[PDB]
Amino acid sequence: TTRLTEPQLRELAARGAAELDGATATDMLRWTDETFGDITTCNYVVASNMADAVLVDLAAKVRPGVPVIFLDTGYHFVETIGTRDAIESVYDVRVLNVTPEHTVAEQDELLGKDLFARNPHECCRLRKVVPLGKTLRGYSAWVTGLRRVDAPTRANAPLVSFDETFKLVKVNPLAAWTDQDVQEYIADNDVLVNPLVREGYPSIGCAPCTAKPA
Numbered sequence: 001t002t003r004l005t006e007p008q009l010r011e012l013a014a015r016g017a018a019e020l021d022g023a024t025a026t027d028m029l030r031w032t033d034e035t036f037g038d039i040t041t042c043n044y045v046v047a048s049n050m051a052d053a054v055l056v057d058l059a060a061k062v063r064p065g066v067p068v069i070f071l072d073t074g075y076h077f078v079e080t081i082g083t084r085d086a087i088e089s090v091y092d093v094r095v096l097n098v099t100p101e102h103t104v105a106e107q108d109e110l111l112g113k114d115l116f117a118r119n120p121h122e123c124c125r126l127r128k129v130v131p132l133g134k135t136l137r138g139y140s141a142w143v144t145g146l147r148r149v150d151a152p153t154r155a156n157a158p159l160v161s162f163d164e165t166f167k168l169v170k171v172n173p174l175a176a177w178t179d180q181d182v183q184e185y186i187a188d189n190d191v192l193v194n195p196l197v198r199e200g201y202p203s204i205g206c207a208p209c210t211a212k213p214a
């Protein structure tokens, strides 16, 4: 394939974690681009849930035409797809609509309707984890917008590491960022934001598995 060897990937992740200690998001993205850029012709990808365009704006500022994957499980909001289209049309980013092999009606007919209500782990595996893994096969590193304030279990989220689920380098530039940080960035850069985030939505994901404000 077109992915670096697993020991090489681990040594690169360790070197990046040790070298990017206390670096800004732009510095981490520049390191990722300089390491996995050549040999479009990009060898790293960015993942965005279309809740905002902060990570997308940063990745486009450090690499015009950077690929950005979006996991379209089929249960998304109309506002989420609208935000995806807006980010694609506005920013200099090549988006990828990663879809599962089975549609919503196909899965409802094969394994029963509303799999999220009966077995949510299998639904998330079939529609999110498996397509993400099938897409990441080929990229030596992938960038995520995970922040250490998202959950108490994410407090020790590392800057650069080796994801053992897909076996490749995982880099989180927005890890050290807080709510005030992302607010100030959205204000100073005028980045697109999902309309549901403006309406008081804590998180943005699949419609049946998203905590409603009310």
Ligand SMILES: Nc1ncnc2c1ncn2[C@@H]1O[C@H](COP(=O)(O)OS(=O)(=O)O)[C@@H](O)[C@H]1O
Binding pocket: 046, 047, 048, 049, 050, 069, 070, 071, 072, 143, 144, 145, 146, 147, 150, 203, 204, 205
């Ligand atoms: N549907 C998705 N499509 C693409 N990337 C996603 C998606 N969901 C999560 N991610 C990636 O993981 C990060 C979000 O992690 P979480 O805090 O756990 O929020 S959540 O939407 O996935 O539940 C995003 O920044 C993104 O890089």
Ligand code: SF4
Binding pocket: 073, 075, 115, 116, 119, 120, 121, 123, 124, 125, 127, 128, 205, 206, 207, 208, 209
């Ligand atoms: S969030 Fe819910 S609907 Fe979306 S893939 Fe996971 S279980 Fe299925």
